[PDB]
Coordinates of N, CA and C in Angstrom, one line a residue:
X1 N -162.7 7.6 -96.6 CA -162.2 8.9 -96.6 C -160.8 9.0 -97.2
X2 N -160.5 10.0 -97.9 CA -159.2 10.1 -98.7 C -158.3 11.1 -98.0
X3 N -157.0 10.7 -98.1 CA -155.9 11.6 -97.7 C -155.1 12.1 -98.9
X4 N -154.5 13.3 -98.8 CA -153.9 13.9 -99.9 C -152.6 14.6 -99.5
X5 N -151.5 14.4 -100.2 CA -150.2 14.9 -99.8 C -149.5 15.5 -101.0
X6 N -149.4 16.8 -101.0 CA -148.7 17.6 -102.0 C -147.2 17.6 -101.7
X7 N -146.4 17.7 -102.7 CA -145.0 17.8 -102.6 C -144.5 18.6 -103.9
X8 N -143.2 19.0 -103.8 CA -142.6 19.6 -104.9 C -142.5 21.1 -104.9
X9 N -143.1 21.8 -103.9 CA -143.0 23.2 -103.8 C -141.5 23.7 -103.5
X10 N -141.3 25.0 -103.4 CA -140.0 25.5 -103.1 C -139.9 26.9 -103.6
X11 N -138.7 27.5 -103.6 CA -138.4 28.8 -104.0 C -137.8 28.7 -105.4
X12 N -138.3 29.5 -106.3 CA -137.8 29.5 -107.7 C -137.8 30.9 -108.2
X13 N -136.8 31.2 -109.1 CA -136.7 32.5 -109.8 C -137.8 32.6 -110.8
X14 N -138.3 33.9 -111.0 CA -139.2 34.1 -112.1 C -138.6 33.6 -113.4
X15 N -139.5 33.0 -114.2 CA -139.0 32.4 -115.5 C -138.7 30.9 -115.3
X16 N -138.6 30.4 -114.1 CA -138.3 29.0 -113.8 C -139.5 28.2 -113.9
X17 N -139.3 26.9 -113.6 CA -140.4 25.9 -113.6 C -140.3 25.2 -112.3
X18 N -141.5 24.6 -111.9 CA -141.6 23.6 -110.8 C -142.6 22.6 -111.2
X19 N -142.4 21.4 -110.6 CA -143.4 20.3 -110.8 C -143.9 19.9 -109.5
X20 N -145.2 20.1 -109.2 CA -145.8 19.6 -108.0 C -146.4 18.2 -108.2
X21 N -146.5 17.5 -107.2 CA -147.1 16.2 -107.2 C -148.1 16.1 -106.0
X22 N -149.1 15.2 -106.1 CA -150.0 15.0 -105.1 C -150.3 13.5 -105.0
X23 N -150.0 12.9 -103.9 CA -150.3 11.5 -103.6 C -151.6 11.4 -102.9
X24 N -152.4 10.4 -103.4 CA -153.8 10.2 -102.7 C -153.9 8.7 -102.3
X25 N -154.8 8.5 -101.4 CA -155.0 7.2 -100.8 C -155.2 6.1 -101.9
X26 N -154.5 5.1 -101.8 CA -154.5 4.0 -102.8 C -155.8 3.4 -103.1
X27 N -156.5 2.9 -102.1 CA -157.6 2.0 -102.4 C -158.8 2.8 -103.0
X28 N -158.9 4.1 -102.8 CA -160.0 4.8 -103.4 C -159.5 5.7 -104.5
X29 N -158.3 5.5 -105.1 CA -157.7 6.6 -105.9 C -158.6 6.9 -107.1
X30 N -159.1 5.9 -107.8 CA -159.7 6.2 -109.1 C -161.2 6.6 -109.0
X31 N -161.8 6.6 -107.7 CA -163.1 7.0 -107.5 C -163.2 8.6 -107.5
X32 N -162.1 9.3 -107.4 CA -162.1 10.7 -107.2 C -161.6 11.4 -108.4
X33 N -162.4 12.4 -108.9 CA -161.8 13.5 -109.7 C -160.9 14.3 -108.8
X34 N -159.9 14.9 -109.4 CA -158.9 15.6 -108.6 C -158.5 16.9 -109.3
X35 N -157.9 17.8 -108.5 CA -157.6 19.1 -109.0 C -156.6 19.8 -108.1
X36 N -156.1 21.0 -108.6 CA -155.2 21.9 -107.9 C -155.9 23.2 -107.7
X37 N -155.7 23.8 -106.5 CA -156.1 25.2 -106.2 C -154.9 25.8 -105.6
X38 N -154.9 27.2 -105.4 CA -153.8 27.9 -104.7 C -154.4 29.0 -103.9
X39 N -153.7 29.4 -102.9 CA -154.1 30.6 -102.1 C -152.9 31.5 -101.9
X40 N -153.0 32.6 -102.5 CA -151.9 33.6 -102.5 C -152.1 34.5 -101.3
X41 N -151.1 35.3 -100.9 CA -151.2 36.1 -99.7 C -152.3 37.1 -99.8
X42 N -153.2 37.2 -98.9 CA -154.2 38.1 -98.8 C -155.4 37.9 -99.8
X43 N -155.4 36.7 -100.4 CA -156.5 36.4 -101.4 C -157.2 35.2 -101.1
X44 N -158.5 35.1 -101.6 CA -159.2 33.8 -101.6 C -158.5 32.8 -102.4
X45 N -158.8 31.5 -102.0 CA -158.3 30.4 -102.8 C -158.9 30.5 -104.2
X46 N -158.1 30.0 -105.1 CA -158.3 30.2 -106.6 C -158.2 28.8 -107.2
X47 N -159.2 28.4 -108.0 CA -159.0 27.2 -108.9 C -157.9 27.4 -109.8
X48 N -157.1 26.3 -110.0 CA -155.9 26.3 -110.9 C -156.2 25.3 -112.1
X49 N -156.4 24.0 -111.7 CA -156.6 23.0 -112.8 C -157.3 21.8 -112.2
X50 N -158.0 21.0 -113.2 CA -158.8 19.9 -112.8 C -158.5 18.7 -113.8
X51 N -158.6 17.5 -113.3 CA -158.4 16.3 -114.1 C -159.5 15.2 -113.7
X52 N -159.9 14.5 -114.7 CA -161.0 13.5 -114.5 C -160.4 12.2 -113.8
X53 N -161.3 11.4 -113.4 CA -160.9 10.1 -112.9 C -160.1 9.3 -113.9
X54 N -160.5 9.4 -115.2 CA -159.8 8.6 -116.2 C -158.4 9.2 -116.5
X55 N -158.2 10.5 -116.1 CA -157.0 11.2 -116.6 C -157.1 11.8 -117.9
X56 N -158.2 11.5 -118.7 CA -158.2 11.9 -120.1 C -158.8 13.3 -120.3
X57 N -159.4 13.9 -119.3 CA -160.0 15.3 -119.5 C -159.5 16.2 -118.4
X58 N -159.2 17.4 -118.9 CA -158.6 18.5 -118.0 C -159.3 19.8 -118.2
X59 N -159.1 20.7 -117.2 CA -159.6 22.0 -117.2 C -158.7 22.9 -116.5
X60 N -158.6 24.2 -116.9 CA -157.6 25.1 -116.4 C -158.2 26.5 -116.1
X61 N -157.7 27.2 -115.1 CA -157.9 28.6 -115.0 C -157.3 29.3 -116.1
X62 N -157.9 30.4 -116.6 CA -157.3 31.2 -117.7 C -156.0 31.8 -117.3
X63 N -155.8 32.1 -116.0 CA -154.5 32.6 -115.5 C -153.3 31.7 -115.7
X64 N -153.5 30.4 -115.9 CA -152.4 29.5 -116.0 C -152.4 28.7 -117.3
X65 N -153.4 28.9 -118.2 CA -153.6 28.1 -119.4 C -152.3 28.4 -120.3
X66 N -151.7 27.3 -120.8 CA -150.6 27.4 -121.6 C -149.2 27.4 -120.9
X67 N -149.2 27.7 -119.6 CA -148.1 27.6 -118.7 C -148.1 26.4 -117.8
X68 N -149.2 26.0 -117.3 CA -149.4 24.8 -116.4 C -150.0 23.7 -117.1
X69 N -149.6 22.5 -116.7 CA -150.2 21.2 -117.2 C -150.5 20.3 -116.1
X70 N -151.7 19.8 -115.9 CA -152.1 18.8 -115.0 C -152.1 17.5 -115.6
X71 N -151.6 16.5 -114.9 CA -151.6 15.1 -115.4 C -151.9 14.2 -114.3
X72 N -152.2 12.9 -114.6 CA -152.7 11.9 -113.6 C -152.0 10.6 -113.9
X73 N -151.5 9.9 -112.9 CA -150.9 8.6 -113.0 C -151.8 7.6 -112.3
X74 N -152.7 6.9 -113.0 CA -153.5 5.9 -112.4 C -152.8 4.6 -112.1
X75 N -151.5 4.5 -112.4 CA -150.6 3.4 -112.0 C -150.2 3.7 -110.5
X76 N -149.7 4.9 -110.2 CA -149.0 5.3 -109.0 C -149.9 6.1 -108.0
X77 N -151.1 6.4 -108.4 CA -152.0 7.1 -107.4 C -151.6 8.5 -107.1
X78 N -151.2 9.2 -108.2 CA -150.8 10.6 -108.1 C -151.4 11.5 -109.2
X79 N -151.4 12.8 -108.9 CA -151.6 13.8 -110.0 C -150.4 14.7 -109.9
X80 N -150.1 15.5 -111.0 CA -149.0 16.4 -111.0 C -149.4 17.7 -111.6
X81 N -148.6 18.7 -111.3 CA -148.8 20.0 -111.9 C -147.5 20.6 -112.4
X82 N -147.3 20.6 -113.7 CA -146.1 21.1 -114.3 C -146.3 22.6 -114.5
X83 N -145.5 23.4 -113.8 CA -145.6 24.9 -113.8 C -144.4 25.5 -114.5
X84 N -144.7 26.1 -115.7 CA -143.6 26.7 -116.4 C -143.8 28.2 -116.5
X85 N -142.7 28.9 -116.9 CA -142.7 30.4 -117.0 C -143.4 31.0 -115.8
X86 N -142.9 30.7 -114.6 CA -143.4 31.2 -113.4 C -143.2 32.7 -113.2
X87 N -144.2 33.3 -112.5 CA -144.2 34.7 -112.3 C -144.4 35.0 -110.8
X88 N -143.9 36.1 -110.3 CA -144.1 36.4 -108.8 C -145.5 36.2 -108.4
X89 N -146.5 36.5 -109.2 CA -147.9 36.4 -108.8 C -148.4 34.9 -108.7
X90 N -147.6 34.0 -109.1 CA -147.9 32.6 -108.9 C -147.5 32.1 -107.5
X91 N -146.9 33.0 -106.7 CA -146.6 32.7 -105.3 C -147.9 32.4 -104.5
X92 N -147.9 31.2 -103.8 CA -149.1 30.8 -103.1 C -148.8 29.5 -102.4
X93 N -149.7 29.1 -101.5 CA -149.8 27.7 -101.1 C -150.7 27.0 -102.1
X94 N -150.2 25.9 -102.7 CA -150.9 25.0 -103.7 C -151.5 23.8 -103.0
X95 N -152.7 23.6 -103.2 CA -153.5 22.5 -102.6 C -154.0 21.5 -103.6
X96 N -153.8 20.2 -103.4 CA -154.5 19.2 -104.1 C -155.8 18.9 -103.5
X97 N -156.8 18.6 -104.4 CA -158.2 18.4 -104.0 C -158.7 17.2 -104.7
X98 N -159.7 16.6 -104.0 CA -160.4 15.4 -104.5 C -161.9 15.5 -104.3
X99 N -162.7 14.9 -105.2 CA -164.1 14.9 -105.0 C -164.7 13.8 -105.9
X100 N -165.7 13.1 -105.4 CA -166.3 12.0 -106.1 C -167.0 12.6 -107.4
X101 N -166.9 11.8 -108.5 CA -167.5 12.1 -109.7 C -168.2 10.8 -110.2
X102 N -169.4 10.9 -110.7 CA -170.1 9.7 -111.2 C -169.5 9.2 -112.5
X103 N -169.1 10.0 -113.4 CA -168.6 9.6 -114.7 C -167.1 9.8 -114.7
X104 N -166.4 8.9 -115.5 CA -165.0 8.9 -115.4 C -164.3 10.0 -116.1
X105 N -165.0 10.7 -117.0 CA -164.4 11.8 -117.8 C -164.7 13.2 -117.3
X106 N -165.5 13.3 -116.2 CA -165.9 14.6 -115.7 C -164.8 15.3 -115.0
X107 N -164.7 16.6 -115.1 CA -163.9 17.4 -114.3 C -164.7 18.2 -113.3
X108 N -164.1 18.5 -112.1 CA -164.9 19.2 -111.1 C -164.3 20.6 -110.8
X109 N -165.1 21.5 -110.3 CA -164.7 22.8 -109.8 C -164.9 22.8 -108.3
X110 N -165.9 22.0 -107.7 CA -166.1 21.9 -106.3 C -165.6 20.6 -105.8
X111 N -164.8 20.6 -104.7 CA -164.2 19.4 -104.1 C -164.4 19.5 -102.6
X112 N -164.6 18.3 -102.0 CA -164.8 18.2 -100.6 C -163.6 17.7 -99.8
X113 N -162.5 17.4 -100.5 CA -161.3 16.9 -99.8 C -160.1 17.7 -100.3
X114 N -159.1 18.0 -99.4 CA -158.0 18.8 -99.8 C -156.8 18.5 -98.9
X115 N -155.6 18.6 -99.4 CA -154.4 18.4 -98.7 C -154.0 19.6 -97.8
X116 N -152.9 19.4 -97.1 CA -152.3 20.5 -96.2 C -151.6 21.6 -97.0
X117 N -151.2 21.3 -98.3 CA -150.6 22.3 -99.1 C -149.1 22.1 -99.4
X118 N -148.6 22.7 -100.4 CA -147.2 22.9 -100.7 C -146.9 24.4 -101.0
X119 N -145.9 24.9 -100.4 CA -145.6 26.4 -100.6 C -144.8 26.6 -101.8
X120 N -145.2 27.5 -102.7 CA -144.5 27.9 -103.8 C -144.2 29.4 -103.7
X121 N -142.9 29.8 -103.8 CA -142.5 31.2 -103.8 C -141.7 31.5 -105.0
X122 N -142.1 32.5 -105.8 CA -141.5 32.9 -107.1 C -140.9 34.2 -106.8
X123 N -139.6 34.3 -106.9 CA -138.9 35.6 -106.7 C -138.4 36.2 -108.0
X124 N -138.1 37.5 -108.0 CA -137.5 38.2 -109.1 C -136.1 38.6 -108.7

């Protein structure tokens, strides 16, 4: 079983950037496809971005395409979310997620493991 730890959230002004990171358990790191989701006030959780086991393939929600970039470090057992041109509607708890994938280049939308979250608040 895998554990997941998000970091890097905080309070930022609209137009700013933030970089989130997610640490995942070392011994199983590369068995899991990984992703980011977020849950804004009053809303269901929303898929944000996904990355394959290999780190070579990615997928994004239309709401963040071009502003957010997901990356993976298979040296250090992390994934990252670079968030640029932030807007108030990006305010949410951001969750890292993991799920087994048979192939190394597959991205997932459904995940069975997720972190406690990191809070992101974008003010104007």
